[model samples]
Target: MINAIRTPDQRFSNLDQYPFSPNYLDDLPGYPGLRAHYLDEGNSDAEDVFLCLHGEPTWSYLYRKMIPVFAESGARVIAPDFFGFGKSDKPVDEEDYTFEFHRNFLLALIERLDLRNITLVVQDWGGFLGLTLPMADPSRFKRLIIMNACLMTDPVTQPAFSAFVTQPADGFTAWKYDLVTPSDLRLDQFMKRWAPTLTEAEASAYAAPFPDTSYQAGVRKFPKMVAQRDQACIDISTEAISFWQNDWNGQTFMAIGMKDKLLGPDVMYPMKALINGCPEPLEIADAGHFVQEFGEQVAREALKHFAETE
Candidate 1:
């Protein structure tokens, strides 16, 4: 059995403005009895399927602004929390997370759900895993919406993950979970620091996932998973890069949160070159690493881009 902790439902009660009905699946093959949460919205048979994936420390709640727009525009939008974040079961052991672990879970979930004609929306760790999904099965994923994220094509771009095992465990705990007196990580401070427009309530909703560190094993493990590259997947990720660069014909949208310190324009501009016919980004002049905080803007621009390009 997976040793895990279930966050209290009451902690999630009355979350600020995120009121989407919850959906859960607990019987996935590798992870028996571990409940994973996702938001399945809009019509199932809609022509377009939007698969939104979030990164570390956040949940399905990150896509609140984008889901309705995609759904409202006659599409199906699905957002799943990688086991340790949001309403998903928190595996107490951080060591269980790895790149292959997450990749396989998502791969299984996609096959199980039979997701097709997919428009993959990715950011942070989401991009880490979602971008690689096509290597296993490319036809299912037809389009992409990339935000501030890295492809991890080399050790330079992902140093932390490359040397993850050597790092001390204590610091990882603070970054992943365990918080109370808002040190430098106050919700509002994070917003104003880069994504300056978020209201207090909106910030709090994002902050709502962890009342304490009890809920953050997945968060801690996300970075650790990125650098566990297999030569096959590296070959796959490399060829996948070429596939996006020269082979793909699907419509693509790029959104840049310019203020992001980690994976901003410096990183994304090079990434844009790797894709075939990637358009000019809808650049949010002041957004940060948590680009979904600016989701309303990105979603609108993406729809507009798709409409004009289509």
Candidate 2:
């Protein structure tokens, strides 16, 4: 196992100022000595537990604003950082990461924590990984809120995404990172606004997990997983859809970003069709792919309502 560069002291230096508490599930058996970091906020005794999961190139820091509010409402909120991202362990080679590996890693954490009656809010690749966990054991979750997510057998091949994958190695990954930001804002301005949310130290702390290009294996491999048109994603999604169709009775809510050029409202049809008794899709206006950043208040309200009413 490749070690993470960010030590615990470095990881939590700015955490106390963030209005949230942090916790770690150390040395999970299968991963062998890799400490999986998760933020556990709100009353531990709260019956309504919200499990928030983030996707590629982002971490639990994505929920920095909403965690305290939800926790204050008498609900237990837990958001986990995937192994390669945030403060978790990162393997030296990207080839070591796989879709199945992530699925199992999350399963281990969920099982270890003994989480039950979960209201899972999943976005981006979070949707793919989060949804699969419930299929493995539907009883673990009670409701699912999906946003800007997809579980398609056919790989998505949008022109913009294709250009990103094929770009020559001169800061290509960094360039693609800029592309995912909302087109309306200048890059420096966006960074300036986003930077303060995590603090300069915390922002640099987040970057510490990935010290070099080789450490970005999981990040680089994530795009290929979605674009490969291979059997792996298809197989997991198929099994998940089948399980939800046959056995899942949990309420599903879709709050889609209408402006998302990649996995927008159009992709909701297949997901809605698969999930029985799904509510009408909530169309978030003026919000693009990174709705969490641009329209967090609206997204949080929508999600909080879904957790309460459903």
Candidate 3:
């Protein structure tokens, strides 16, 4: 059984940085009655669909910087808050936050909207999960824009290129622990370290959804879910890599925020290796894990690059 909790509307009063009204879906196919939030912008008659997916802790708020840039291109931008984050209904049970749970929820939304001609932009867990969507509906996606992610960014090219990538040295043997246990689970500190430039209000908005430890079921569980590398993610990654490497007919753009301690240029260079026709990325020297800190420049560059190629 799935038990869900909703963050009170009052909790998200007036977040000035986010101007758009949230378009919510409470009647999705797989998980009906569970509310989720997404920002749908730009013209419906527009051909391109820019689907932005956020990672743990942050919500659709993360894309506020890039949304307008894509809107200027007349492409629809869709950014959804996974079940646990943002205005989406949060499930109090951390056990409910499995890899398949998040993946299927997104697939359901895509099908419900018939989102196509998609230019999928993914970062962090957004990449970990969104990259698998193409495997479910390949025809829907036409291009890719990825940021710091849990991706296999290994140098599949020249040895010199490998010099730029620092493979993940080591990690835990098994995924276990909860928010109270892991002191590093400080959401505020984590955000400050990774995306420090966020204004005081912006940082508060990120934490608004989690008013207390009880409200953080999703946040507390994402790292554990990621650490275990549930076979679904692994299998799907294999599938996506095969598709991007051999079958994908789409163009790809990667951006590396060199400062990301875990998923920075040290990691993205090889991801460039994996995708077919993925060119050298837009490198943001100072940006870290939350690459959108340099969102305007990233968005402008992406729009121009895709336009030139189109």
Candidate 4:
């Protein structure tokens, strides 16, 4: 059993704009005693499931704006807090959090929920990991809604991936430095800096999962994994490159948060080129790295696009 801490329910009380009730899975195979929290919204039996995945330092709250929109379209939306974020149980040891550990949790979640016909939504680390999932269970996923995220492929084979893994002075570098070096990393202030569009309450909600530094092991480990890419992650990601380029046949929608310096057009264009039939992206001029801050618009447009195609 994993030794983990659960965030108290009081910390999440009256969260602004987040009205969804809590759903927990404490018996997922291999997860034993660890409870995973996810927001299950929209129609429970809907065939179109929008699986919203949040990246580093953020939680299900990141998709607050988009959840309602997706649900309003009569689609189910599942946004889970990776083991150590939001309302999920936080593993105490930083070493306990690994690429496979997080990746496997997602795989297990899909099986546990028996989710199908999924429209995968992702950003940041969410994309890094989420982008690679369809290869493992291609039949379950039906479409994609990607924004400001990319695969962690081998740098030697992928120049864009190389730049992201090794670039010295860009916004991502500075952001990593800030996340890594801070002994007392403040999530509220950090969210404000990255997503300036966030209101004070929204920013606080991002910080709500961690009452203190002890609860941030998952947050702390995500950036380091990107900076220190492992062979397993790179190998799978490299393979995913082939799958998306040659095998994927589902409808895809990509959006770029224009003001994002970390994973902006430079990063997204190469990603767009890699995915077979990925059309021109919807560029949101003022949105930053956390594009979900402007997610209502993105979700609405994506649903519209999907409807047009249908």
Candidate 5:
């Protein structure tokens, strides 16, 4: 049995602008006795489903601004917290968390929930994993809303992908150093630093999942995973490129957090080139790494673009 801990419900009380009800899945195929949290909003049977995935030290709480916008448009919006982040169960052992572990959980959730007609929305680690999901069940996904995220390829084929892995002095390296080096990570401080646009209340909401360092094993591993990309991750991600470039026939809307030091225009532009028929991105100049901070505008623009194209 995998050992895990659930954050106290009290910690998430009275969050800023987060009024969505809680939804949990405790009996997933591979994950036994672990409760995963997700927010399900809007029309239950809507033809369009927006699956918003959060990444790195953040949770479903990150998509507070964007969730409502999608829901208001008569669409179903589902934002899930990966095993380690948000209101989900946190495994005590960092080793328990792996590329397949999280990926499989998502696959299970999608099937269990029977979610279809999905418009995948992702940023940060959300993009990293979410970008590869359509390849597994392309029929379930129809639209893409990419934000500052890319596939984790092996052998370093792409120039932009290579620069991120090879350059020791890159902004991502520094960010990785900041995340992994700190044993007692302060999520509020970390969120504020990376997403400068957050309010004091908003930043603290990001910290609500972990009361102390013991609950941060997942937070600790994510950066290390990026730095040391494993073979399985590389292999699957490598396959994903072909899927997006050739097989993918879905509509895509790219949004760039221009101020994001880790995955900014440099990273996003190359990503756009890989996805077949991906048009010019909507560049948010003032937005930093957590472009979701300015998600209200991004959500509106994406919906408008999708409508215009249709």
Candidate 6:
């Protein structure tokens, strides 16, 4: 059985004002009896569907700003929180999570939704998970907008990133916030900027998913899961990259943050070269790995244009 730290009402109080609908499906036999929460905004009849997937230590709330913008423009927006994150169920044990498990869970959700004409806007772990679905079924996706993320064939062992993974537990928590703001920004100053847009309740909503340090097994384990030179994840990433390169003929765009400490401009070259159909790169200045937070308006325009032209 899966255990959760907070009640639905306590954990997601920030969403109390916003409409909350559960996207539950009984078809997924292996998933623990947990209903996933997703924000489905805009017209159901809209031909263009924007599927936004977020990454580690973040939830669908990260796209809270972009969802309405796309919805008003006649696009259907679907942003689901990965299990153990956001409003979804959190298992008590870290062993309950794995890359393959997440891939399968998302595949089940997509199948249930029967989504088509997809404009996938993925970031962080979103790229890793989103890329897997497209690799399996190219026909379902119409376009892809990847930002500050990687689909790596081998686990990146950069000194800076590696150092981050091995930090003390408290230090690891500090690093999560550090990755969101400019390196020069002080923690208190950064929180002030981050807090104004999101209420204290909303901030708690983001942090609620992980009740304590023990609950952060998935977050801690995620770094270890990144593909290493000869690891299984690297092997899978290699194969998928080849498939996407050879098979995909649709539009592909990379909107990278130049300042992202984790995934910067240097990481995008291979993706650019391999994705034969993409025409130009979309670089966001003054943005870090969390470009969605800092450079959202720019990203919104870029996505709007990509949808219009493609």
Model 5 residue runs over 4 Å out of place are: 165-170
lDDT of 6 by residue, 1-310 (tens): 5664433555454452345465645346567576677778888888888898988667787777677777877889889987767766666566677777777887788787888889888887888778767887777888877776667554342233233333444443445545433324232233334334445555555665654554455555454465222255566666777777798877776777776556666566556766768667777776666667654574566666676775
After the best TM-score superposition of candidate 5, give how far the Cα of residue 117 lies from its true spot, in angstroms: 0.6
TM-score for all models, in order of appearance: 0.85, 0.79, 0.89, 0.98, 0.97, 0.79
Clashing pairs in 2: 94-217
lDDT of 1: 0.75
Pairs that collide in candidate 5 are none
Candidate 1 accuracy as TM-score: 0.85
Give residue 237's lDDT in candidate 6 (0 to 100).
65
Per-residue lDDT of 136-207 in model 1, one digit per residue for the tens? 788897889999765655555434323333344533233333332243444434434444676777666666
What tens-digit string does per-residue lDDT give for candidate 4 at 1-310?
7889999999989699989999999998888899999999999999899999999989999999999999999999999999989999999998999888989999999999999999999999899999989999999999999999988877678777658554647677888887878999999999998888788999899889999899988988999998788888989899999999999999999999999877888889999999999988999999999999999899999998999898
For candidate 2, lDDT tens digit of each residue in 165-247? Answer: 34444333443455333333232233333333334544553454444554455666665566563577668776777776777
lDDT of each: 0.75, 0.66, 0.78, 0.91, 0.90, 0.66
Off by over 4 Å in 1: 156-196, 225-236
- Candidate 5, residues 172-289: lDDT per residue as tens digits? 8878777788877798998888878789999999899999998999999998888788889989889999999999999999999888777888889999999998988999999988
lDDT of 4: 0.91
lDDT of 3 at 249: 80
lDDT of 6 at 149: 65
Order the candidate numbers by lDDT, best to worst: 4, 5, 3, 1, 2, 6
Query: In candidate 2, which residue ranges exceed 4 Å CA deviation?
Result: 2-17, 155-211, 294-300, 303-310
List RMSD in Å for every model shown.
4.6, 5.5, 4.0, 1.0, 1.2, 5.4
Best of the two (1, 5) by lDDT: 5
Q: What is the Å distance of residue 106 in model 3 from its true position?
A: 1.1
TM-score of candidate 3 relative to the true fold? 0.89
